[PDB]
Amino acid sequence: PTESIVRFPNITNLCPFGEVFNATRFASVYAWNRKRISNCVADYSVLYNSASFSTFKCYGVSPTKLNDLCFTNVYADSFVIRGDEVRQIAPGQTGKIADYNYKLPDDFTGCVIAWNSNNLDSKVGGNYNYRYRLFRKSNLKPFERDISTEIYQAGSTPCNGVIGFNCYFPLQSYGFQPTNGVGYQPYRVVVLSFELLHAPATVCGPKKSTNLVKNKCVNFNFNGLTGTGVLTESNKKFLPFQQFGRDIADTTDAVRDPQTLEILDITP
Amino acid sequence: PTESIVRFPNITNLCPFGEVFNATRFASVYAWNRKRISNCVADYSVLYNSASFSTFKCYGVSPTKLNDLCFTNVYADSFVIRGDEVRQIAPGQTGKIADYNYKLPDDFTGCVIAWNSNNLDSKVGGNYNYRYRLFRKSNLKPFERDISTEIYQAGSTPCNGVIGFNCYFPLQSYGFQPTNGVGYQPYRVVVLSFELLHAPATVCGPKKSTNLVKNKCVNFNFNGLTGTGVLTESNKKFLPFQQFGRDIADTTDAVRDPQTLEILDITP
Amino acid sequence: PTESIVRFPNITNLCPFGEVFNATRFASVYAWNRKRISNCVADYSVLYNSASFSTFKCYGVSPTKLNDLCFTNVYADSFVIRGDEVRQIAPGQTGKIADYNYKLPDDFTGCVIAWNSNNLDSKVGGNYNYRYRLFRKSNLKPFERDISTEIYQAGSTPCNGVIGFNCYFPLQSYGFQPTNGVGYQPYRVVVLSFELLHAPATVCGPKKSTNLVKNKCVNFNFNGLTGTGVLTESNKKFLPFQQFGRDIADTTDAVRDPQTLEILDITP
Amino acid sequence: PTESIVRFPNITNLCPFGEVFNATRFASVYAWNRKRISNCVADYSVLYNSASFSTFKCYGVSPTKLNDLCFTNVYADSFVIRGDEVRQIAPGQTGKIADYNYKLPDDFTGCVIAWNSNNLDSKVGGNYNYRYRLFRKSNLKPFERDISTEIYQAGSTPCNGVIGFNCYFPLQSYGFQPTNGVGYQPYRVVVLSFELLHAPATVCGPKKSTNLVKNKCVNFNFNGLTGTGVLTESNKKFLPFQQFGRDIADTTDAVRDPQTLEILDITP
Amino acid sequence: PTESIVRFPNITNLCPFGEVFNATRFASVYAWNRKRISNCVADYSVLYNSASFSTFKCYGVSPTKLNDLCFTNVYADSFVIRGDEVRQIAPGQTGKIADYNYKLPDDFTGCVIAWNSNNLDSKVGGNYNYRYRLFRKSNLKPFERDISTEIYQAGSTPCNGVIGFNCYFPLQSYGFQPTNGVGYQPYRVVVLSFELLHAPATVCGPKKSTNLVKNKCVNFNFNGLTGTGVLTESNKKFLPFQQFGRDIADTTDAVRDPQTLEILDITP
Amino acid sequence: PTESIVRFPNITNLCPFGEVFNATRFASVYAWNRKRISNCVADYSVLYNSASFSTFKCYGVSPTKLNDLCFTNVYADSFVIRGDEVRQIAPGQTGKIADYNYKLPDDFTGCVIAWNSNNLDSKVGGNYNYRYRLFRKSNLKPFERDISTEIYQAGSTPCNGVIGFNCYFPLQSYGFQPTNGVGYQPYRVVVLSFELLHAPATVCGPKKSTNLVKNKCVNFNFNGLTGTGVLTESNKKFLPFQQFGRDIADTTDAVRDPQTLEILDITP
Ligand SMILES: *[C@@H]1O[C@H](CO)[C@@H](O)[C@H](O)[C@H]1NC(C)=O
Ligand SMILES: *[C@@H]1O[C@H](CO)[C@@H](O)[C@H](O)[C@H]1NC(C)=O
Ligand SMILES: *[C@@H]1O[C@H](CO)[C@@H](O)[C@H](O)[C@H]1NC(C)=O
Ligand SMILES: *[C@@H]1O[C@H](CO)[C@@H](O)[C@H](O)[C@H]1NC(C)=O
Ligand SMILES: *[C@@H]1O[C@H](CO)[C@@H](O)[C@H](O)[C@H]1NC(C)=O
Ligand SMILES: *[C@@H]1O[C@H](CO)[C@@H](O)[C@H](O)[C@H]1NC(C)=O
Ligand SMILES: *[C@@H]1O[C@H](CO)[C@@H](O)[C@H](O)[C@H]1NC(C)=O
Ligand SMILES: *[C@@H]1O[C@H](CO)[C@@H](O)[C@H](O)[C@H]1NC(C)=O
Ligand SMILES: *[C@@H]1O[C@H](CO)[C@@H](O)[C@H](O)[C@H]1NC(C)=O
Ligand SMILES: *[C@@H]1O[C@H](CO)[C@@H](O)[C@H](O)[C@H]1NC(C)=O
Ligand SMILES: *[C@@H]1O[C@H](CO)[C@@H](O)[C@H](O)[C@H]1NC(C)=O
Ligand SMILES: *[C@@H]1O[C@H](CO)[C@@H](O)[C@H](O)[C@H]1NC(C)=O
């Protein structure tokens, strides 16, 4: 191959990562806010090169390569937790946050971002506006939220909606102090889950497209699908929903152009 | 003086310190339990010799000399706190327990007995039945309790007694676990308050009453009234409520016998 | 398989776990006490459900699946160690307790049960009755107890049976106090070690036996020997010590019934 | 006394305490910033009401009585130091800040106001902008500022104006991290200094100025001069520099009215 | 007064502060080594100005003024303790060291000099040669040395020279390691006690003797006795053991010259 | 095999570890000193048996098996750090010392030796002769040394080589004190890296050389190459740079003796 032919869709607007990562108030972990990111371009090397983030652990994908991939959808989950609970935001972990507040699936393709927010979220005299669910009958399914406020019966006696002996309120405040220990500062956590459905991808990295070159052995990056071959005109009539064609060997024979919406036939 | 004579009333019922120190369940610090001890002989040797009481700080009375004195009324304040906040139970300190839960007066005459109770008040998974008042409008008065449960407004919004943003429950749980450190481990605290007024003493030690030896220079202890003199037979007509007697110079010159109700002149 | 058949020997006495776990005085770690448990029914549910054991770590056996398995004999090793020495009671770990006091094998099968015992093993002023072996020439073998009290020759000079310079006593006191931190607090440790030999299993869980079903395909648990097959009456004669009849293919072909003493061939 | 009279000069402007306490960037402790507060009304109650301040130690004047008094001049000193070194801002105290950076007089009249400033002064990657003088040949005199950057010589070898072995820069960077403990936490300290010398007082509390009641026995606070008397007219020839007279008994008997510049007589 | 006359005895030999402080191995605190120091010039500013001692806290005398004083005898008591126990070497303090190992009288006059000794007194694997007395029936008297090794009876059972249950060895090892914390770190402590009683002075400071001038008003420092007066010839026949002279007014009116053994009349 | 033949060359001098480990002064971590050790005998068991080395971690070799295997060349890297960043001297670890001062490759072969030096590298009042590189624009490559003293521009403004606002000096002082904590105490670190490139061995340990026995199946160690064979005589034409010889089977079959320059055929 001589030169790569990158074809990405003609998207003009950047993804609203700034509003998600720089918002004034984040939600509590029991009622975490999920934002749907779609139909835009997202720069992921801005997040990595910024040294504000204490944690940038990515599972199932590499953080440096994130600008080269087109995901179908992005879900951004934002909440505030304790410092010692940051390690519970991982696939296959146990604890109060993992079981009762935010559960990550084992088959997780995404990145976990955690930065210290002692400056903006903590307050002297106590910031008790951040609460976490401490009591639940059963553990949470992955990507499930619990906003219930029913009194957790921890004994034989019914509670009748009144707090007291063995009847506790399900949500407990953190009590954040600026004079707290290293494990007790507020941490804002944004979990970026990359949905990779077999669909037209709408969140692409910031890569400049290259105009189409055919009839020669070239590299190509069609919607994040890297390959090498000769691109020719395809007689095959793809259905409108269909975006890829798979041979008997499960390798893409043809791809629908993401800019001019035509069919190109890949040959080795 | 030749010999020492001690005359006490013939009270043989032992004071209920077993109910105070060996109760199955204590109460929370916001609703600390007060017990009135009177009209019994008190044994403070069993408190002093015990090898479980980590803190035995006595204010206004010597801890070794608890057995010698006589009092009228004893107030036992039992509650459960954590280790770091045991130091707040003293005259003149600040903190959440001192300001909003239990305040000791600066003129406190009594002892503070604190011992670790990690085995009885901690449960694996958390023992949340012990609560403390965390928010209050104004600091507490000495020997004042606040068992009201009203939602504390921490902002400028009238939120109608529903927990949420800037409206917090007044009581917060300790959440005791056996794995927690000694700063956050349960400590049972019994505060003994002795009041010595111009009243006949009802709480005394187990000091034996000796025989009445008159017309000799003896050291004497009549119901806690120590001194030296030559006790003889009197002709004064005390009224039944009148225990001792005073001269023109406001010095004790006659006492009533605790046992046989006989008036004895103390000449020096 | 249509039905499930469980056959266990008709033994009814409970195993003396109460004597092991609720004893008033535990021995020191250098002279740890091993008790042989056999010929009884062991209910491991009462250990698991109760919330006092801070550390409950099983190696080689799933902790929640203790009830269904049958063991030949159980050895319970009890001792007292401080909080930072709890992590050394594990296979493959190092430390003073692992090298000189109690060493577990790398192939250990069983559970480690450690709970805080600050009330029973600490007195104010120091509880020095719990000693650990501090000096030894060589590390201990697995499950080997050393109670020798010769003076340790640290230097090049003969000790001559007197403590002095470069000659130390091998045992050293913990010195527990209730004010000490959780690293220096008493923990009572019971190590359950299960052996699975060719002997008949005597320590079985609280699972209840069912009726024997013959000539039909069932799923059977014969005294811990799980399997599936058509149980049929056999003409095989087993010697009294022999309990099962593995063939040339190392698969269980016949089992002696633990109650009625019947030889039962298994057809797949 | 029939009533109370408070006569203060007709000063309208509020004191610029917003530009001192809420300044964007404080100076370092080696070059601490001193601001002269005069000719304005000062409200010290609003400083005491805020719970942001973690240290409000006032020496020689009580914090509750701050609004009552009047002063001629206020010296507002501001700097940033770590949490462990807050205690060295005290009269008759020793330390690095006391010897080399900021020394208070042994008889100091004012308030040391220190609050935690983690949110304003810390940043990720460390805020090293705040420097403290660590090396000096001699200890600092009280209220003396040293901004010399000469290289301190520790050994006999002359430094020659370059950094090297035994020749160190006199200023050391603090190294404030958001993840540091409370010991190394950035704290902003404001040291208010008051002069009690007799002069025309320019700064007073927010107390309302009442009318002038003559020939009736009233309490008075004439520009901070507390007393009780019958305020009558005077025929004394007060010169312009003379603000309050005195008698042969060295007691205050004639005070100039601050608003009218009219001499009044205090009659007991 | 015109001149100042210092007369000290003609001694030149320096007493071994080097052997006290720079010894290779010190002694344990239960068997602290006391050395008698007499007939020497002692340069206390060598110990004061050297940046080697972490603590140089002096009781009853100023450390800077020690060069200008003369004492009859100096006791140097050297031992090794831990960092947290350095505080306990003081009058009116409690602990294990103060009660059982080294006790200081309440009228103590001297200095306590403590410096860290990590490289000398620690070893990887534990340095156990430094022992402290942990058990004693009664508290120690001031300056009492106890080197007895008898088994402490902490219970009712006789011990009979065998260590075991409730029978402990009285000496307990520190167990120093170089990786230990600064509280558990080996500190060498030397306590200097000065006999200021009425006796011939032997230990004197490095002040140089000046020539004797008579019949004028001069300040004088005769063997550490300071005054102002006129020195003249005296007819008082002193007995050879007598140094000072005194009258009914309890004032020193005659002294003996340290060098010429001449009796001088101090006329004021 | 019958006996083992260990053949080491005729080397008489010892490797100069004395000034590497027991030098009076060490260099700082930014200017880490490197010493090349070759052509001598090194006794690693002296370092192994030392009672002062707290950390003796090794990578790519066993800490027990370092003496018997002998290496081509030894690079000794010496620097002083504090106790917290001892863990940062490991491959793959991230930190200030790792990124900016001393970086080890991920395939590092050798041993890290660290020991506390609080009595040598700390002085009362502070020892500031040991510096570390705090700021660098890029992370260091493995084994590169950067001693540049250029002013680190931390802001946008060009300040032209002067210290000031965001123009920090790159080096900073540890500031060791004897009373500091174990994290802030000096630790001398000697990294002993070894390369195993294709070259004749120059440093080998103190193991003695045995006489040759030919025509018998003996275990042999020919200067780091260990095998089993019948070392018969040869007739090879080995050029003087050929240390050993390999056949078509890619196995060692001819070794020239290091002590006699005689080629020996290894026959299986
Ligand atoms: C949030 O604001 C800061 C301040 O300018 C900026 O550096 C950062 O890049 C912003 N975050 C995002 C995701 O743009
Ligand atoms: C953008 O892409 C669409 C197909 O996705 C195409 O129809 C349209 O013409 C493109 N816009 C421009 C300006 O080329
Ligand atoms: C509580 O019970 C224990 C049980 O032996 C006893 O020793 C102790 O004296 C009791 N407490 C009081 C105050 O009597
Ligand atoms: C006991 O005291 C009472 C006073 O209440 C008295 O009446 C009675 O006689 C006394 N009894 C004896 C045996 O002293
Ligand atoms: C020990 O005694 C307690 C007392 O309630 C009981 O709950 C526990 O089950 C006992 N332990 C065992 C192993 O039976
Ligand atoms: C109990 O087991 C024994 C086996 O030794 C057997 O002989 C006996 O019949 C059994 N009893 C019952 C009631 O099953
Ligand atoms: C600084 O700003 C805060 C913001 O609300 C305010 O509450 C405070 O009073 C201000 N400080 C002063 C001295 O005015
Ligand atoms: C304000 O004070 C000045 C002098 O103190 C006086 O001359 C003037 O009349 C006053 N004005 C008012 C309105 O009181
Ligand atoms: C101990 O030896 C060192 C070595 O130079 C010396 O500086 C110090 O002054 C000596 N101390 C005494 C008390 O002699
Ligand atoms: C030294 O002092 C003695 C008295 O103790 C005296 O007899 C002698 O003459 C003195 N010598 C000198 C040289 O001053
Ligand atoms: C000493 O070394 C030389 C050169 O390496 C060698 O030729 C000689 O044989 C050696 N000496 C002995 C006794 O082997
Ligand atoms: C450094 O000196 C000590 C002094 O005994 C010695 O034990 C040690 O072996 C020396 N270090 C080396 C590397 O030889």
Residue numbers in the entry:
A (entry chain D), B (entry chain A), C (entry chain E), D (entry chain B), E (entry chain C), F (entry chain F): 322 to 589
From the reporting publication:
The Delta and Kappa variants of SARS-CoV-2 co-emerged in India in late 2020, with the Delta variant underlying the resurgence of COVID-19, even in countries with high vaccination rates. Herein, we report cryo-electron microscopy (cryo-EM) structures of Delta and Kappa variant S protein trimers – both in the unbound state and in complex with the ACE2 receptor – to gain insight into how their mutations underlie changes in ACE2 binding and antibody neutralisation escape. Within the receptor-binding domain (RBD) of the S protein, both the Kappa and Delta variants share an identical substitutional mutation (L452R) with the previously emerged variants of interest B.1.427/429 (Epsilon). Finally, the P681R mutation (present in all B.1.617 lineages) immediately precedes the furin cleavage consensus sequence (682-RRSR/SVA-688), with initial reports suggesting that the P681R mutation enhances cleavage, and consequently S protein post-fusion transition.
The Kappa and Kappa + Q484I dimer-of-trimers are structurally very similar, with RMSD values of 0.262 Å and 0.705 Å for the global and focus-refined atomic models, respectively. Rather, a combination of charge neutralisation and additional contacts enabled by sidechains at position 484 is required for S protein dimerisation.
